[PDB]
């Protein structure tokens with residue numbers, strides 16, 4: 292599923308992501324924009340052989356099981372496929388664990404490089420929330 296901007300903001304809010312760990316909703320929307328272009332089926336292979344999955348490009352090295360990342364963990368206790376669903380519940384639940392892991396949203400390198408410090412409220416501008 293390819294979400295609209297405000298559609299995704301609303302789904303993230305429903306699932307309690309807004310201001311989770313102090314990160315306003317526009318931070319999450321901006322991160323999704325640059326990680327997946329709002330496409331739940333986004334995947335991207337890393338050089339190390341891990342894969343990133345879904346709207347927030349969550350990595351199999353630590354967070355989900357795909358059966359093909361040797362030595363990896365599955366800290367969200369989910370198949371990485373669950374991260375590609377139209378329903379974002381698994382992605383949001385796992386994102387909450389990632390953002391609580393110590394480095395905040397810096398776990399998402401695209402958020403650090405393209406969202407951090409910017410006018411992230413623009414991402415929820417105009418949205419009926």
Ligand SMILES: [Cl-]
Pocket residue numbers: 292293
């Ligand atoms: Cl689609």
Ligand SMILES: [Cl-]
Pocket residue numbers: 315316317318411412413415
């Ligand atoms: Cl915001």
Ligand SMILES: [Cl-]
Pocket residue numbers: 356357358359360361362363
């Ligand atoms: Cl594995």
Ligand SMILES: [Cl-]
Pocket residue numbers: 312313394395396
């Ligand atoms: Cl933080």
Ligand code: NA
Pocket residue numbers: 351352353354355356357358360363364365
């Ligand atoms: Na894994």
